[PDB]
Amino acid sequence: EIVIRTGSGDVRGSKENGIAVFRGIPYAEPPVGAHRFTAPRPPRPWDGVRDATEFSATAPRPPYPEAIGALLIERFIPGDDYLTLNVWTPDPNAVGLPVMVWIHGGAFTNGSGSEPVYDGAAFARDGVVFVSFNYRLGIIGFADLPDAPSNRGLLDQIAALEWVRDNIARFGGDPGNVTVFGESAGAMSVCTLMATPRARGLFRRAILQSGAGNMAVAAEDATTIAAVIAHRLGVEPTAAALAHVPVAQLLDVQQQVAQEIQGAPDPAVWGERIAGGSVLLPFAPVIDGELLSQRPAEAIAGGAGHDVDLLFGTTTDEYRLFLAPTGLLPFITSDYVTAHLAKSGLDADAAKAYTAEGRGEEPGDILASIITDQVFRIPALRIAESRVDAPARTFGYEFAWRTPQLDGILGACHAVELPFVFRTLDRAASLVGTNPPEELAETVHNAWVRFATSGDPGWPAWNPETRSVMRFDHPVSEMVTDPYPATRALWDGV
Numbered sequence: 195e196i197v198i199r200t201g202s203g204d205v206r207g208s209k210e211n212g213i214a215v216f217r218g219i220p221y222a223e224p225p226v227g228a229h230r231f232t233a234p235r236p237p238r239p240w241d242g243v244r245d246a247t248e249f250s251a252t253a254p255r256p257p258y259p260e261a262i263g264a265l266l267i268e269r270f271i272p273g274d275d276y277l278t279l280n281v282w283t284p285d286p287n288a289v290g291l292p293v294m295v296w297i298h299g300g301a302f303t304n305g306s307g308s309e310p311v312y313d314g315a316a317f318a319r320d321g322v323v324f325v326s327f328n329y330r331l332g333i334i335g336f337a338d339l340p341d342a343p344s345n346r347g348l349l350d351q352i353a354a355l356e357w358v359r360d361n362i363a364r365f366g367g368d369p370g371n372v373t374v375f376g377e378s379a380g381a382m383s384v385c386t387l388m389a390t391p392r393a394r395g396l397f398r399r400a401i402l403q404s405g406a407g408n409m410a411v412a413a414e415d416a417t418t419i420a421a422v423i424a425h426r427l428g429v430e431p432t433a434a435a436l437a438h439v440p441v442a443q444l445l446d447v448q449q450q451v452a453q454e455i456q457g458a459p460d461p462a463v464w465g466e467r468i469a470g471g472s473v474l475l476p477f478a479p480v481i482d483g484e485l486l487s488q489r490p491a492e493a494i495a496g497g498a499g500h501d502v503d504l505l506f507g508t509t510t511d512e513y514r515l516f517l518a519p520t521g522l523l524p525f526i527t528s529d530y531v532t533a534h535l536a537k538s539g540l541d542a543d544a545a546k547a548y549t550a551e552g553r554g555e556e557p558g559d560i561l562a563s564i565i566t567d568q569v570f571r572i573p574a575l576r577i578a579e580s581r582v583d584a585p586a587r588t589f590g591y592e593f594a595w596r597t598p599q600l601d602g603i604l605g606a607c608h609a610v611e612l613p614f615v616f617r618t619l620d621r622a623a624s625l626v627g628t629n630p631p632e633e634l635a636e637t638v639h640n641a642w643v644r645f646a647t648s649g650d651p652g653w654p655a656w657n658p659e660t661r662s663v664m665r666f667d668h669p670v671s672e673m674v675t676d677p678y679p680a681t682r683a684l685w686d687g688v
């Protein structure tokens with residue numbers, strides 16, 4: 195047992211195998227009932243010692259779709275008191291350790307800070323204090339309502355980072371050397387936080403794994419989403435009304451909304467905009483004129499975050515996670531790809547560029563590469579291009595290792611780098627297989643520690659001339675210049 199006094203009361207953690215670990219430290223009061231929709235409230239001070247040996251409840255979430263869910267096996271924990279954070283440090287009484295703060299992904303609807311694959315022990319054993327946490331998700335986190343502040347989930351993330359600022363020195367960390375990092379929705383959250391004055395000084399460096407500054411819900415779309423949710427619940431689209439809905443009913447309707455938007459929305463239900471594809475993620479942060487007055491990429495184009503060191507990257511075959519496991523790909527037709535390209539204003543022959551660069555010969559494979567570029571690769575490069583004159587540094591990676599799961603159909607799909615970053619390969623066998631290469635997890639994890647420690651991951655910085663990134667792969671990880679250049683240029687005016 196090991197007892198540490200936070201700014202609001204003592205907590206009891208555990209010191210085993212050379213590392214002190216604290217689980218379930220509250221940073222915000224339970225968001226119950228009407229407080230599903232209020233700003234996060236600092237926990238009520240306490241006397242005595244709060245037990246911090248066990249992960250807390252996690253935020254309410256519906257199951258992943260079955261195929262995805264078979265690859266990403268989530269660990270649910272029941273309860274109401276879920277706005278908590280977790281700390282791993284090698285020595286609470288050390289001074290000046292780098293701090294990493296993880297923001298989990300999961301399309302703003304799923305995930306938790308305490309998933310087994312996000313274990314922080316490997317970072318602590320390398321001399322870094324590691325923090326993870328839960329934030330509000332789905333309707334509760336992000337649905338926009340006239341009588342509630344927008345983007346509670348983002349308010350939660352700011353509150354957790356403010357706890358780290360005001361408490362991490364008591365766990366051995368330097369609050370002036372905080373690296374925030376996330377994957378997918380967590381990385382889009384990092385770009386959103388870089389973009390708002392409300393979070394300046396809460397971190398010195400950022401790592402963006404498969405997420406950029408393109409994910410925001412237009413206020414008029416968020417209103418439509420709320421109206422459909424309330425109609426199916428038989429209530430008014432207000433916090434006053436949704437405060438009383440049993441959570442299982444909230445989740446069931448939330449699930450149907452997400453399925454409908456990820457497919458081909460029915461204009462009769464969703465209006466012309468959403469049926470036309472204006473919404474990529476229906477519970478992404480809304481443009482509120484408070485935290486978001488524009489898409490984060492445009493704030494960053496305006497100089498937001500230019501003082502924060504940046505490490506960014508994507509996987510080679512990102513979108514294959516969402517298209518391949520459900521057998522969708524063999525049925526895709528050339529005319530469908532052409533029509534897809536035509537919504538972005540590109541001619542039919544743009545698909546040949548993908549074939550010429552080895553990014554697909556069949557329409558379905560070409561489609562997956564196109565959407566990989568539109569949602570992940572190009573948005574990441576736009577942030578990097580925006581930082582040409584930034585005083586801080588910018589480094590890039592491509593995670594190219596391909597998983598063998600599902601008979602090789604995924605490639606280097608979305609989320610595949612996570613257990614390599616955390617050296618938790620043995621907890622992600624459903625995604626990476628039973629014998630992934632530990633040497634690569636060593637390489638990737640060590641570069642993350644180097645970047646947290648010094649602001650340099652150990653390879654040349656990214657610039658718009660050579661567009662150099664570190665290509666992570668198993669036998670050999672090595673630098674490459676401007677990968678996939680022809681397919682990149684297709685999007686220049688787009």
Ligand SMILES: O=C(O)c1ccc(C(=O)NCCO)cc1
Nearest residue numbers: 299300301302377378379380569
């Ligand atoms: O564009 C999408 O459809 C999408 C983007 C990001 C996520 C995510 O943050 N989690 C990874 C697996 O859910 C999910 C879906």
